[model samples]
Target: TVESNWGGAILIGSDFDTVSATANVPSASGGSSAAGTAWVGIDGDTCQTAILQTGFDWYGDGTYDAWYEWEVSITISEGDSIQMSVTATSDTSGSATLENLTTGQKVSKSFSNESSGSLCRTNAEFIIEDFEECNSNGSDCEFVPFASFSPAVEFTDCSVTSDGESVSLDDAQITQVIINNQDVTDCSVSGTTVSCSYV
Candidate 1:
């Protein structure tokens, strides 16, 4: 079964260096392995061949976590506002950071030639994802069932840097990923803000 793992706004263009936005820790429901993530990222949309991204995962079982190639050890909760960013220094090197505005916790990480392949620096995105879980060997992977997000999560102050100038989603190309032919979430872009909520 073929499936798209995300639902949100993706700004498509070229030469994207840095991307940043503030998003809330969306509340989740469903009570199983169902879960989803809200994130801001660079590349990996049009340039799926390479990716550098970060954000938070909220689970149906009332658990929350962070992703890092990329994490500096932090705790999070629903409704907390988090600001996240990704900056590419080169195709293969860069950094990612996140700050919890509610708790004043901030952290970051830098990556340089660590063998994940070269990033294309082509797209910036604000996404709510039903992520894929892979085997230890990174061979087999499957989309985790998505949890319902209530009250919606909004990503504000969104910006993408291209040619050293910051850009908004004003002229972005956005398409919601359809999972099993179902629209799992309502997503849209409003200039500097992007929003999504599970259906």
Candidate 2:
């Protein structure tokens, strides 16, 4: 699973209550058009059943906005400082908060008992993805090319809360992303931050 889709850090542990990060929406570019996301989440890597995640998207145009996995969307703009957090109350339900710190706009939502996604509390992650979006029917999906971020994207003040203790990504696994056999990401993690550069 640590292949072509995403690039970032994942802390493999048990019963993670919260996972979060903050970063300025990195500027995006790569010629004509491309798209991707900057997100922080819980349970998407090892626990694939459900990913409690949220972040803002750089849509290849001049648009950027906050979005949660269950489609919680709020308008934001480039260079805005944002925070995304997922708190798992139980395996089947949880709460999400998305905040635009610079704009002072935020949204919170609670999710319970979605039919397909149940968190196993095995992993917490910070990821940048070459994501897919479904068409109007919502079944057939198409992937947009991952946009190249200027210089690099760094997530700071990040931590994973397991049980009652909080920890940094220093011991987490570093994940890189590939596209069509080309190495597209180079990432590193330190005490409380992870910096990812497009390769």
Candidate 3:
């Protein structure tokens, strides 16, 4: 029963072949049973649809999960060094991969599922989010507490590509979602690293 979602997110408008980032999983907060996720993804700016995404998840039970889901999976642990990436083979198809650099375990999936809406090719993101998981009725949805992943979810060596060139954060828009007039998190860039963390 906090206010709203609290996390850091960076967005860019561009057609991308690849989006990747390295992050260190934070320890869980042990507060309320909420869920949070950090991921590198593409095409969610205009249509609220993801073309591709891969990253890690934390649940209310204090379980840390690694996932490379395009349309798929992995088991991850707290404090793991994770590398997540999404590569587009075409506008409508791609592969998502997540690597547990600590355990050297990895998971990947390929997707060709057609999106219900059109991709603006206008957005890519590295975000830490209070994700919504729903019941069958879709009426009991909740914003998981961002318990752990404390201090923040850092995105390092982050980069986005278009056609065949690099898209700089300077050319993109930075967004921070705040609820109830309080800033929950923030994003910043220095060189190639774009770090997002909860405040």
Candidate 4:
């Protein structure tokens, strides 16, 4: 797990309409309790507040389970390959889609709601996160042990768009993830591909 609460790359831009990527879903083992999501979308970073996101949630209750999701469900599994994308039709509206390339299952959703604050469209991200949950009494829940998304959570074809122009990860700002002040993930860009791996 990263110290920042999330692990991924964030691209800075404005009026971004499209973001897409491919991730190799990490495997689960030993009935370990861990949870993570991999998504590519617009405006959920330091520069903006809203996120038009689509990806998979990988979690372990006893056995691991996965599913295509947007903000929130078809069941997916470990070692599955998936592609996800989010596209904005307007400043405050967009659609998110996910496909399990390994199983041919797909899910899509549309949203028109706005964030509490104005969206800058100024930052986009593709991430794997150890998500948080709160208790019924408004207290923080117990922290689950971080699972290994090993081999890698490879993100290929990573790209973003603004005014119909495409910007690949090669030209975007780079941010590596650190856990316990130690860099535990390696994120690199080569041409249009941005790959991340747990080290």
Candidate 5:
């Protein structure tokens, strides 16, 4: 049966060689039957390196797990922050796993591409935290949010323009003006909208 719905996925850890459950065969009190199997591959920064395993299957059903893998690369602009805007056209719940090469932290986050469902469609801003301390304790440690842009803004472009000019005539004066708005206003406009001719 082709049934499609929204559900989240998770990677417990590498230590968990496999996720075992009771489906058939006698309880493993004295023995067990291997009806399922799983294998995961997470690549490092260098394409020359990657983790691969054959006969790897989630669901542990030997062949009943969903197949998911991506060859796409994530690009970060040259700035303190990497701005990304993603609009999902499908309604589904999924997660993305990322390796913070710089910080050596691996983390996962769940997201929905829907706007009105139990999921969210707004934009999200987050700062990559280095889980060094937590990791030092052990690999089974959850990361902490160090820097964040919570209330993830729905990746909306908020930009404005401004211009102003003044002209003087023999006995009359003329003036021209224009203005633009931005998410964050300039200090000159401290606690107020900016003046004309502002960038």
Candidate 6:
């Protein structure tokens, strides 16, 4: 089977870095792996980090190839709206990087970026609910990593916008690989609407 090791997530030009987290909302001092905080470094190796956002190391175990599919969720307060998008690239040397498939606002502003490629599977969906709608005007976002897309075999693009306005979220990225002699290249995304499939 194919194995993967993923690293941190960095915003285009901001200092925002992707931290492996499980609790979604890590404490002020960062969450812990045992406490469900995402294991930032793959395999517990923290020496190196993800600087380019889409750096992936694919390892095949003579049985299957590994692929990465990430689903992120963001909670938008009442009267607040945002946009989301994704981009991907290969870690292979001299490989061309991927770009945003659609413009921002083409997709939904939900917390799930269900973009996958070959070796894909039907994962869970994220829904929005009214959880103590804060009266403060400021905003807060969190990253809660799911186990479905573990040992990411791929890394591309994942991000979101916030404002509470009904905007289109069309930015999504997906990469596939043939593994375990299986061509699993079908993915489904349900964002408060009908479920849609991607290759």
Who wins the TM-score comparison?
Answer: 1
User: Tens-digit lDDT track for model 6 on 58-152?
Assistant: 11111111112221222311111122222222221111121122221122211232233111111111111011113346575332211122222
Cα lDDT of model 3 by residue, 68-116, tens digit: 6543345677777898888886767788888888888887777775575
Per-model TM values vs. the true structure: 0.92, 0.90, 0.84, 0.84, 0.19, 0.19
Model 1: lowest-lDDT 10 consecutive positions: 66-75
| Poorest 10 consecutive residues by lDDT, candidate 6 | 121-130
Model 2 per-residue lDDT tens digits across residues 42-121: 88777778888888778666566667873735667777778888898889888888888888988988998777768998
The total number of steric clashes, by the backbone 3 Å criterion, in model 5 comes to 6
State which candidate has the highest lDDT: 1
Query: In what order do the candidates fall by lDDT, top score first?
Result: 1, 2, 3, 4, 5, 6
RMSD for all candidates, in order, please: 1.9, 2.3, 2.6, 2.7, 24.9, 18.5
Residue-by-residue lDDT tens digits, candidate 1, 63-99: 8887755242478988899999999888888899889
TM-score quality measure for candidate 6: 0.19
lDDT of 4 by residue, 64-182 (tens): 44433323555577777888888888767778888888889888877666555445677778876656667889877754555556667888877788889987775566665556787
In candidate 5 the C-alpha lDDT for residue 89 amounts to 25
Per residue, candidate 5 scores C-alpha lDDT tens digits across 1-199 of 1121101111211221111111111111111211212112222112222221111111212212212222223221111121221222222343434332333434343445423332122211111111212455576653221111221211112111112121111221111111122221111111111121111
The local lDDT score (0 to 100) that residue 106 gets in candidate 1 is 86
Off by over 4 Å in 6: 3-160, 163-169, 188-199
Model 4 regions more than 4 Å off: 60-71, 113-118, 141-143
Better model by lDDT: candidate 4 vs candidate 6: 4
lDDT: the better of candidates 1 and 6: 1
Model 3, residue 10: distance off in Å is 3.3
Model 2, C-alpha of 94: deviation from truth (Å): 1.1
Evaluate model 3: give its TM-score: 0.84
For candidate 3, what is the lDDT? 0.70
TM-score of model 5 (CA atoms): 0.19
Higher-TM-score candidate of 3 and 6: 3
